[PDB]
Paper text:
The crystal structure of the catalytically active form of PmC11 revealed an extended caspase-like α/β/α sandwich architecture comprised of a central nine-stranded β-sheet, with an unusual C-terminal domain (CTD), starting at Lys250. A single cleavage was observed in the polypeptide chain at Lys147, where both ends of the cleavage site are fully visible and well ordered in the electron density. The two ends of the cleavage site are remarkably well ordered in the crystal structure and displaced from one another by 19.5 Å. Moreover, the C-terminal side of the cleavage site resides near the catalytic dyad with Ala148 being 4.5 and 5.7 Å from His133 and Cys179, respectively. Consequently, it appears feasible that the helix attached to Lys147 (α3) could be responsible for steric autoinhibition of PmC11 when Lys147 is covalently bonded to Ala148. Collectively, these data suggest that the pro-form of PmC11 is autoinhibited by a section of L5 blocking access to the active site, prior to intramolecular cleavage at Lys147. This cleavage subsequently allows movement of the region containing Lys147 and the active site to open up for substrate access. His133 and Cys179 were found at locations structurally homologous to the caspase catalytic dyad, and other clan CD structures, at the C termini of strands β5 and β6, respectively. The PmC11 structure reveals that the catalytic dyad forms part of a large acidic pocket, consistent with a binding site for a basic substrate. Asp177 is located near the catalytic cysteine and is conserved throughout the C11 family, suggesting it is the primary S1 binding site residue.
Author numbering:
A (entry chain A): 24 to 147
B (entry chain B): 148 to 375
Amino acid sequence: TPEPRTTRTILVYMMANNSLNSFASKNIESMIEGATSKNLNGGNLIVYYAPAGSPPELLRIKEENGVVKKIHLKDYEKQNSADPDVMRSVIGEVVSQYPADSYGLVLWSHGTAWLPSDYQNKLK
Amino acid sequence: AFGQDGNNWMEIDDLAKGLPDDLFDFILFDACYMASVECTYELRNKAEYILASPTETMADGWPYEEMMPQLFATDLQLEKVGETFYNHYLNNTYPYATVSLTKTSELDNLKSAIHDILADKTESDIYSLDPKNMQRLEYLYRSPGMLYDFNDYIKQLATAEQYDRFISCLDKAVVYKAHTPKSYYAAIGNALPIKSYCGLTIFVPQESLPKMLEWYKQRVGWYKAVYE
Protein backbone atom coordinates (compact mmCIF):
# COMPACT_ATOMS: atom_id res chain seq x y z
CA THR A 1 0.00 0.00 0.00
CA PRO A 2 2.65 2.66 -1.02
CA GLU A 3 2.01 6.39 -0.61
CA PRO A 4 1.52 8.39 -3.84
CA ARG A 5 4.87 9.35 -5.34
CA THR A 6 5.92 12.80 -4.16
CA THR A 7 8.65 15.29 -4.99
CA ARG A 8 11.08 14.25 -2.24
CA THR A 9 11.56 11.65 0.51
CA ILE A 10 14.26 12.18 3.09
CA LEU A 11 15.28 9.40 5.46
CA VAL A 12 17.16 10.24 8.67
CA TYR A 13 19.03 7.11 9.80
CA MET A 14 19.92 7.66 13.46
CA MET A 15 22.43 5.29 15.11
CA ALA A 16 22.14 6.49 18.68
CA ASN A 17 22.88 3.24 20.66
CA ASN A 18 26.04 4.97 21.91
CA SER A 19 27.03 8.24 23.78
CA LEU A 20 24.91 10.49 21.51
CA ASN A 21 21.71 8.80 22.88
CA SER A 22 20.63 11.90 24.86
CA PHE A 23 21.13 14.22 21.85
CA ALA A 24 19.10 12.13 19.37
CA SER A 25 15.85 13.18 21.07
CA LYS A 26 16.83 16.92 20.91
CA ASN A 27 17.56 16.58 17.17
CA ILE A 28 14.19 14.86 16.54
CA GLU A 29 12.40 17.66 18.43
CA SER A 30 14.24 20.17 16.19
CA MET A 31 12.97 18.26 13.12
CA ILE A 32 9.43 18.36 14.60
CA GLU A 33 9.66 22.18 14.96
CA GLY A 34 10.69 22.49 11.29
CA ALA A 35 8.50 19.82 9.66
CA THR A 36 5.32 21.82 9.05
CA SER A 37 3.13 21.01 5.95
CA LYS A 38 4.39 24.26 4.38
CA ASN A 39 8.06 23.42 5.05
CA LEU A 40 7.81 19.77 3.89
CA ASN A 41 6.39 21.09 0.59
CA GLY A 42 4.60 17.77 -0.07
CA GLY A 43 7.66 15.65 0.77
CA ASN A 44 8.07 12.80 3.26
CA LEU A 45 10.28 12.97 6.36
CA ILE A 46 11.01 9.50 7.65
CA VAL A 47 13.22 8.71 10.66
CA TYR A 48 14.85 5.37 11.53
CA TYR A 49 15.62 5.82 15.21
CA ALA A 50 17.95 3.35 16.99
CA PRO A 51 18.51 4.58 20.59
CA ALA A 52 20.30 2.98 23.54
CA GLY A 53 17.59 1.67 25.89
CA SER A 54 15.06 0.16 23.45
CA PRO A 55 14.63 -1.44 20.01
CA PRO A 56 14.70 0.63 16.83
CA GLU A 57 11.65 2.33 15.39
CA LEU A 58 10.56 3.81 12.11
CA LEU A 59 8.77 7.18 12.39
CA ARG A 60 7.10 9.62 10.00
CA ILE A 61 7.15 13.29 10.99
CA LYS A 62 4.12 15.17 9.62
CA GLU A 63 1.72 17.94 10.49
CA GLU A 64 -1.95 17.12 11.09
CA ASN A 65 -4.53 19.54 12.44
CA GLY A 66 -1.90 22.23 13.11
CA VAL A 67 0.48 19.99 15.13
CA VAL A 68 3.64 18.30 13.81
CA LYS A 69 3.49 14.71 15.15
CA LYS A 70 5.89 11.75 15.36
CA ILE A 71 3.85 8.97 13.78
CA HIS A 72 4.87 5.46 14.72
CA LEU A 73 5.26 3.33 11.56
CA LYS A 74 6.86 0.24 13.08
CA ASP A 75 8.90 -1.22 15.88
CA TYR A 76 11.83 -3.41 14.94
CA GLU A 77 13.16 -6.24 17.05
CA LYS A 78 16.66 -5.83 18.44
CA GLN A 79 19.03 -5.56 15.44
CA ASN A 80 22.46 -4.30 14.52
CA SER A 81 21.81 -0.96 12.80
CA ALA A 82 25.50 -0.85 11.72
CA ASP A 83 25.07 -4.10 9.71
CA PRO A 84 24.96 -3.02 6.01
CA ASP A 85 22.23 -5.62 5.36
CA VAL A 86 20.03 -3.97 8.02
CA MET A 87 20.69 -0.49 6.58
CA ARG A 88 19.86 -1.69 3.03
CA SER A 89 16.67 -3.34 4.26
CA VAL A 90 15.49 -0.19 6.12
CA ILE A 91 16.29 1.99 3.12
CA GLY A 92 14.35 -0.44 0.91
CA GLU A 93 11.30 -0.40 3.22
CA VAL A 94 11.29 3.41 3.20
CA VAL A 95 11.80 3.90 -0.55
CA SER A 96 9.13 1.28 -1.31
CA GLN A 97 6.49 2.84 0.92
CA TYR A 98 7.41 6.56 0.32
CA PRO A 99 8.35 6.74 -3.38
CA ALA A 100 9.63 10.07 -4.68
CA ASP A 101 11.23 11.88 -7.59
CA SER A 102 14.27 12.52 -5.43
CA TYR A 103 15.71 11.06 -2.27
CA GLY A 104 17.96 12.37 0.47
CA LEU A 105 19.69 10.54 3.28
CA VAL A 106 20.78 12.01 6.59
CA LEU A 107 23.33 9.71 8.27
CA TRP A 108 23.42 10.53 11.97
CA SER A 109 25.91 8.94 14.36
CA HIS A 110 29.51 9.05 15.48
CA GLY A 111 32.05 9.29 12.69
CA THR A 112 35.81 8.91 12.24
CA ALA A 113 36.22 9.34 8.43
CA TRP A 114 37.78 6.16 6.86
CA LEU A 115 39.52 5.17 10.08
CA PRO A 116 39.23 1.59 11.23
CA SER A 117 36.97 1.38 14.31
CA ASP A 118 39.87 -0.32 16.16
CA TYR A 119 42.36 2.46 15.18
CA GLN A 120 43.62 2.75 18.78
CA ASN A 121 45.32 -0.62 18.29
CA LYS A 122 47.12 0.51 15.09
CA LEU A 123 49.08 3.49 16.57
CA LYS A 124 52.52 1.81 17.28
CA ALA B 1 34.34 4.43 10.54
CA PHE B 2 30.72 5.61 10.68
CA GLY B 3 27.86 4.52 12.85
CA GLN B 4 28.21 3.05 16.30
CA ASP B 5 25.61 0.48 17.43
CA GLY B 6 26.79 -0.87 20.80
CA ASN B 7 30.27 -2.32 20.05
CA ASN B 8 29.60 -2.47 16.28
CA TRP B 9 30.70 0.04 13.66
CA MET B 10 30.45 0.42 9.94
CA GLU B 11 33.84 0.65 8.28
CA ILE B 12 33.83 2.96 5.25
CA ASP B 13 33.66 -0.03 2.82
CA ASP B 14 30.79 -1.56 4.87
CA LEU B 15 28.92 1.78 4.65
CA ALA B 16 29.34 1.71 0.84
CA LYS B 17 27.77 -1.84 0.95
CA GLY B 18 24.82 -0.61 3.04
CA LEU B 19 23.90 2.00 0.41
CA PRO B 20 22.19 1.40 -2.92
CA ASP B 21 23.95 2.77 -6.03
CA ASP B 22 22.59 5.90 -7.72
CA LEU B 23 19.43 6.36 -5.67
CA PHE B 24 20.11 9.31 -3.34
CA ASP B 25 20.58 12.85 -4.66
CA PHE B 26 22.48 13.65 -1.47
CA ILE B 27 23.88 12.24 1.74
CA LEU B 28 24.16 14.62 4.68
CA PHE B 29 26.46 13.35 7.41
CA ASP B 30 25.48 14.65 10.86
CA ALA B 31 28.65 13.04 12.17
CA CYS B 32 32.26 14.02 12.83
CA TYR B 33 35.02 13.72 10.26
CA MET B 34 33.06 12.49 7.24
CA ALA B 35 34.21 15.20 4.77
CA SER B 36 37.24 13.08 3.97
CA VAL B 37 38.40 12.74 0.34
CA GLU B 38 38.68 8.98 0.85
CA CYS B 39 35.12 8.69 2.20
CA THR B 40 33.61 10.84 -0.57
CA TYR B 41 35.49 8.71 -3.13
CA GLU B 42 34.27 5.43 -1.51
CA LEU B 43 30.68 6.78 -1.67
CA ARG B 44 30.97 8.44 -5.12
CA ASN B 45 28.26 6.23 -6.69
CA LYS B 46 25.91 6.53 -3.66
CA ALA B 47 24.89 10.19 -4.12
CA GLU B 48 25.32 13.19 -6.40
CA TYR B 49 26.29 15.37 -3.42
CA ILE B 50 27.86 14.75 -0.02
CA LEU B 51 27.31 17.45 2.63
CA ALA B 52 29.56 16.87 5.64
CA SER B 53 32.08 18.22 8.14
CA PRO B 54 35.79 17.57 7.83
CA THR B 55 36.24 18.08 11.62
CA GLU B 56 34.10 17.43 14.69
CA THR B 57 30.60 18.80 15.07
CA MET B 58 29.09 19.85 18.42
CA ALA B 59 26.70 17.31 20.05
CA ASP B 60 23.62 19.47 19.24
CA GLY B 61 24.28 18.56 15.60
CA TRP B 62 22.74 20.18 12.57
CA PRO B 63 19.97 22.87 12.90
CA TYR B 64 17.07 20.73 11.62
CA GLU B 65 14.37 23.30 12.41
CA GLU B 66 15.95 25.97 10.20
CA MET B 67 17.18 23.55 7.52
CA MET B 68 13.84 21.84 7.02
CA PRO B 69 12.28 24.11 4.39
CA GLN B 70 15.63 24.23 2.53
CA LEU B 71 15.95 20.41 2.46
CA PHE B 72 12.41 20.05 1.02
CA ALA B 73 12.48 23.09 -1.29
CA THR B 74 11.47 22.56 -4.93
CA ASP B 75 14.82 24.16 -5.90
CA LEU B 76 17.08 22.24 -3.55
CA GLN B 77 20.35 24.10 -2.98
CA LEU B 78 22.57 22.13 -0.59
CA GLU B 79 24.98 25.07 -0.36
CA LYS B 80 22.12 26.94 1.43
CA VAL B 81 21.68 24.05 3.86
CA GLY B 82 25.43 24.02 4.53
CA GLU B 83 25.31 27.83 5.06
CA THR B 84 22.42 27.44 7.54
CA PHE B 85 24.57 24.99 9.54
CA TYR B 86 27.62 27.29 9.45
CA ASN B 87 25.63 30.45 10.28
CA HIS B 88 23.97 28.58 13.19
CA TYR B 89 27.33 27.73 14.77
CA LEU B 90 28.91 31.06 13.98
CA ASN B 91 26.19 32.56 16.27
CA ASN B 92 26.24 29.76 18.93
CA THR B 93 27.75 29.69 22.46
CA TYR B 94 30.28 27.15 21.04
CA PRO B 95 31.07 28.70 17.63
CA TYR B 96 32.91 25.68 16.22
CA ALA B 97 31.88 24.20 12.88
CA THR B 98 33.27 23.15 9.50
CA VAL B 99 31.29 22.20 6.43
CA SER B 100 31.77 21.24 2.81
CA LEU B 101 29.68 20.12 -0.14
CA THR B 102 31.25 17.60 -2.54
CA LYS B 103 29.91 17.00 -6.08
CA THR B 104 30.61 13.33 -6.67
CA SER B 105 30.50 13.49 -10.53
CA GLU B 106 33.79 15.46 -10.30
CA LEU B 107 35.60 12.93 -8.09
CA ASP B 108 36.91 10.75 -10.94
CA ASN B 109 38.66 13.81 -12.47
CA LEU B 110 40.04 14.78 -9.04
CA LYS B 111 41.27 11.17 -8.58
CA SER B 112 43.17 11.42 -11.86
CA ALA B 113 44.79 14.72 -10.80
CA ILE B 114 45.84 13.15 -7.49
CA HIS B 115 47.01 9.87 -9.09
CA ASP B 116 49.28 11.82 -11.39
CA ILE B 117 50.96 13.34 -8.29
CA LEU B 118 51.03 10.42 -5.82
CA ALA B 119 51.41 7.26 -7.91
CA ASP B 120 55.17 7.76 -8.34
CA LYS B 121 55.79 8.87 -4.72
CA THR B 122 57.73 6.61 -2.37
CA GLU B 123 57.58 6.14 1.39
CA SER B 124 60.74 8.29 1.56
CA ASP B 125 58.98 11.13 -0.30
CA ILE B 126 55.91 11.02 1.90
CA TYR B 127 57.72 10.47 5.22
CA SER B 128 59.98 13.45 4.42
CA LEU B 129 56.99 15.78 4.99
CA ASP B 130 56.86 17.63 8.30
CA PRO B 131 53.27 17.48 9.68
CA LYS B 132 53.90 20.85 11.38
CA ASN B 133 53.78 22.49 7.88
CA MET B 134 50.15 21.29 7.23
CA GLN B 135 46.83 22.05 8.88
CA ARG B 136 45.90 19.19 11.24
CA LEU B 137 42.13 18.58 11.27
CA GLU B 138 41.77 15.64 13.65
CA TYR B 139 42.53 15.11 17.30
CA LEU B 140 41.13 11.71 18.23
CA TYR B 141 42.13 10.20 21.56
CA ARG B 142 45.82 9.04 21.48
CA SER B 143 46.14 10.08 17.83
CA PRO B 144 49.48 11.55 16.74
CA GLY B 145 47.58 13.39 13.90
CA MET B 146 46.46 11.39 10.88
CA LEU B 147 43.98 13.58 9.02
CA TYR B 148 45.21 16.85 7.52
CA ASP B 149 43.89 19.40 5.13
CA PHE B 150 43.81 17.76 1.64
CA ASN B 151 45.12 20.88 -0.16
CA ASP B 152 47.98 21.29 2.31
CA TYR B 153 49.25 17.73 1.77
CA ILE B 154 49.02 17.85 -2.01
CA LYS B 155 50.69 21.29 -2.12
CA GLN B 156 53.73 19.74 -0.39
CA LEU B 157 54.10 17.01 -3.06
CA ALA B 158 52.88 18.53 -6.33
CA THR B 159 54.93 20.38 -8.92
CA ALA B 160 53.51 23.85 -9.77
CA GLU B 161 51.79 22.49 -12.89
CA GLN B 162 50.38 19.53 -11.05
CA TYR B 163 49.15 21.81 -8.29
CA ASP B 164 47.33 24.14 -10.72
CA ARG B 165 45.55 21.12 -12.24
CA PHE B 166 44.69 19.85 -8.77
CA ILE B 167 43.16 23.23 -7.75
CA SER B 168 41.02 23.34 -10.93
CA CYS B 169 39.73 19.81 -10.19
CA LEU B 170 39.32 20.51 -6.45
CA ASP B 171 37.16 23.58 -7.14
CA LYS B 172 34.87 21.53 -9.39
CA ALA B 173 34.49 18.84 -6.67
CA VAL B 174 34.25 20.99 -3.51
CA VAL B 175 31.53 23.42 -4.61
CA TYR B 176 30.89 24.98 -1.18
CA LYS B 177 32.87 25.16 2.05
CA ALA B 178 32.95 27.21 5.25
CA HIS B 179 34.67 27.16 8.61
CA THR B 180 34.48 28.96 11.87
CA PRO B 181 37.81 30.45 13.11
CA LYS B 182 38.38 27.44 15.38
CA SER B 183 37.25 23.84 15.49
CA TYR B 184 36.57 22.00 18.77
CA TYR B 185 38.02 18.56 19.53
CA ALA B 186 36.42 16.44 22.25
CA ALA B 187 39.51 14.43 23.17
CA ILE B 188 41.56 17.56 23.97
CA GLY B 189 38.64 19.56 25.40
CA ASN B 190 39.68 22.59 23.39
CA ALA B 191 39.19 24.47 20.14
CA LEU B 192 42.13 25.11 17.82
CA PRO B 193 42.56 27.56 14.89
CA ILE B 194 41.97 26.64 11.29
CA LYS B 195 44.64 28.52 9.24
CA SER B 196 44.22 26.61 5.91
CA TYR B 197 40.97 25.02 4.78
CA CYS B 198 39.81 23.30 1.57
CA GLY B 199 36.79 21.42 2.99
CA LEU B 200 38.24 17.88 2.87
CA THR B 201 40.73 15.91 4.86
CA ILE B 202 43.23 13.30 3.69
CA PHE B 203 45.31 10.68 5.46
CA VAL B 204 48.96 11.71 5.70
CA PRO B 205 50.95 8.47 5.94
CA GLN B 206 53.67 8.73 8.55
CA GLU B 207 56.64 6.61 9.45
CA SER B 208 55.27 6.00 13.02
CA LEU B 209 51.96 4.54 11.66
CA PRO B 210 52.83 1.47 9.51
CA LYS B 211 49.79 -0.55 10.69
CA MET B 212 47.45 2.33 9.80
CA LEU B 213 48.94 2.51 6.29
CA GLU B 214 48.58 -1.29 5.83
CA TRP B 215 44.90 -1.09 6.73
CA TYR B 216 44.37 1.94 4.48
CA LYS B 217 45.98 0.06 1.55
CA GLN B 218 43.73 -2.97 2.01
CA ARG B 219 40.43 -1.30 2.88
CA VAL B 220 40.23 2.26 1.53
CA GLY B 221 39.63 2.37 -2.26
CA TRP B 222 41.38 5.77 -2.59
CA TYR B 223 44.75 4.17 -1.83
CA LYS B 224 44.86 1.87 -4.89
CA ALA B 225 43.15 4.60 -6.96
CA VAL B 226 45.86 7.26 -6.41
CA TYR B 227 49.05 5.59 -5.04
CA GLU B 228 49.19 2.68 -7.52
